[PDB]
Design a protein around this nucleic acid. Structure first.
Lengths: 322, 81
DNA sequence: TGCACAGGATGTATATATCTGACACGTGCCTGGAGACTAGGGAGTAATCCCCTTGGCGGTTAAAACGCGGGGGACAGCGCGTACGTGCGTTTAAGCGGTGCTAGAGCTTGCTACGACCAATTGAGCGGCCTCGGCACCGGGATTCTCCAGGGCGGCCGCGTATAGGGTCCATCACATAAGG
DNA sequence: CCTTATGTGATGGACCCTATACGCGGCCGCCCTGGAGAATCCCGGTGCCGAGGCCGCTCAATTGGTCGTAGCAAGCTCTAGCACCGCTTAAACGCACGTACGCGCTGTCCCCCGCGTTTTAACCGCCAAGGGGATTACTCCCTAGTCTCCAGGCACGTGTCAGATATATACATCCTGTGCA
């Protein structure tokens, strides 16, 4: 935000701190002394920003962050480790960028209790009704790869999935329940799509206000003698919204069932999305001007250069901390 | 009338200190400010009331206030002097 | 079928006017200047007696100055924890003008009683002078506080005895399963 | 389906070696012991010179009378203060998040105290005054305290002029049936 306030009438606007315009840049018409992309680095800045944002953005709801340091808070690390189960390593693409992930399950205790009750019922039903062969080891391996081991047999449906970045293990995010999931059997690729609202906090707070108003009205009526959906409500503020889509690759057959079971009934979210699409304000698509004039944009160029220098200076320490 | 020492509020002390150009304030300041104002008012009011009672009087006039302040050395202009 | 426009509807920045404050011009009364009387405080005059430098000088002394050691006081850094800064939603009562009372303030009285002014007496109070005991200085025995040395415990550190303990790497173990019939 | 006896695959554990407390001893914080000695306390014990007492006397505090107008007592009257109404905000308030500020502790180093040696400022006595300044009094005379008339110019108020507020208008910003392409 503290970036230099661009001089009036520049042929670009500063979007996310960088020079961009809605229309495709016409350098040849607009620039007399264009600095090279090497000189500008705008492309570099954009790429670093993109990757970092993908590491830290709002795409998935955050749920756990490593606490910024005989404090017992150390003892909670193994507890948080055990509250999730450990699962195998998978690749993700974010726009032009790609990332890698290991998978972790969030232990739904109701599924554990119901599994114990189901085993009780099945046992009671059964009681009421009443060298070594390596090929068998290969069969067991394949069965455990496409059928389910005990932890997978309990967590088939309603299991909870946590995402973590293998290049940034500090943050954990929820897999979107309000998402469309397609499992490509031929390519082993999974595409996830969801709509995201930039002022969602505004909508949630107005939703809370409406809930309070309805509760007050019900209390007033009671003094004499609910699937509240903010997106349906006529007084909901305009969502600034974006539709998003992402592809996963590298997930194995057994995990697909867990994932496929985990997401919400499709028609309901489809109708919700259609409402969002009527009421939403779509994010406008714009084009970055990677080339800047060395004379009119000298301040902007140097500012970008300085910020890049600081970013790189910090980035070395990140691995030096490992 | 009760608790009117509180009636000054914090925000009034805030605004007055803002006139004084203070960039940073502490919570304890308010109580001390109230005490100082209390003793100042007590002295000024006692002087004014004795100035009034001399004249076989019942209404404290602006003359009594301004001359009481003059006796405290604090000189005030613009109220009919 | 859907568009162009003929006929019609709320509105409003532009424009014309009405609803409140302040300054200049008119009355009219407690005056400000002026005339003359007045005297006693101010100013001009003359001692007169007392206190202030002479003027640098030497021979001294008490205080000032200058030099030095050092050690601890100031002070720039900074880890960190929180309590004031900024930003909501929400409530109070501070502000606005309005209606009905009044009592305290303003001043005009009519004139009295106490204090301005005056001779005359006399004694309290001031001015001069004289004096012994209240004060000023410190000698003394005793008080008491300072400050390094350091006996001695033992916190902590040192050589190194022998010892108690943790993170680290190794694995043993259970659920329900693989196999024969 | 029954029915032996174990595969599957981690979290749970014993171990290696680490590093440590402390035997005997010292630096050090500290109790305290300890001395030397550098001050400070209180009591003479004394000889000096001022407090304060005593007397001479003079001028101003006190007195009895007179004159007159400043304070007092209504008491007439009128407007500024007081109180309750009751809408309208908006300034206060509770509460949430954070962040940059204040404090605790750090090491550093420079300057200002404790103290010793040198230098300067000051007084005593030389040598006894003359100058000129502040106090004191007499002697006009001029000055503005006084009563009084003259006639005003300054203050209290109303009228007039301007400004801030109010509201038509000449279209402004639009609605909407329907005839045209």
């Amino acid at each position: 935000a503290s970036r230099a306030k661009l001089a009036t009438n520049r042929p670009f606007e500063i979007v996310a701190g960088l020079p961009a315009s809605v229309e495709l840049p016409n350098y040849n018409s607009s620039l007399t002394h264009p600095q090279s992309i090497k000189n500008s680095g705008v492309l570099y800045d954009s790429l670093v920003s993109s990757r970092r944002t993908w590491v830290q953005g709002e795409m998935f709801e955050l749920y756990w962050r490593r606490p910024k340091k005989e404090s017992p808070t150390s003892g909670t690390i193994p507890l948080i480790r055990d509250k999730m189960q450990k699962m195998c390593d998978c690749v993700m693409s974010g726009g032009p960028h790609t990332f890698k992930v290991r998978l972790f399950i969030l232990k739904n205790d109701k599924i554990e209790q119901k599994w114990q009750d189901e085993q009780e019922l099945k046992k009671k039903e059964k009681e009421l009704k009443r060298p070594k062969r390596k090929r068998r080891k290969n069969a067991i391996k394949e069965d455990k790869d496409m059928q389910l081991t005990a932890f997978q047999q309990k967590y088939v449906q309603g299991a909870e999935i946590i995402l973590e970045y293998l290049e940034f293990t500090h943050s954990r995010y929820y897999l979107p329940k309000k998402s469309v999931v397609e499992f490509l059997e031929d390519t082993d690729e999974i595409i996830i799509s969801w709509i995201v609202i930039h002022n969602s906090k505004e909508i949630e707070k107005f939703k809370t206000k409406k809930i309070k108003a309805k509760l007050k009205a019900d209390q007033k009526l009671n003094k004499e003698d609910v699937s509240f959906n903010p997106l349906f409500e006529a007084d909901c503020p305009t969502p600034l919204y974006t539709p998003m889509t992402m592809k996963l690759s590298g997930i194995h057959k057994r995990f697909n069932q867990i994932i496929r079971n985990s997401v919400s009934p499709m028609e309901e979210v489809v109708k919700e999305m259609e409402k969002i699409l009527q009421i939403g304000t779509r994010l406008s698509g714009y084009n970055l001007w990677y080339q800047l004039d060395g004379y009119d944009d000298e301040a902007l160029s140097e500012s970008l250069r300085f910020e890049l220098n600081e970013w790189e200076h910090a980035m070395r320490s990140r691995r030096h901390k490992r | 009338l009760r608790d009117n020492i509180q009636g000054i509020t914090k925000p009034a002390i805030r605004r007055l200190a803002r006139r004084g150009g203070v960039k940073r304030i502490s919570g304890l300041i308010y109580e001390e400010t109230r005490g100082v104002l209390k003793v100042f008012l007590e002295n000024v009011i006692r002087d004014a009331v004795t100035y009034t009672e001399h004249a076989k009087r019942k209404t404290v006039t602006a003359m009594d206030v301004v001359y009481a302040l003059k006796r405290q050395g604090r000189t005030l202009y613009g109220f009919g002097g």
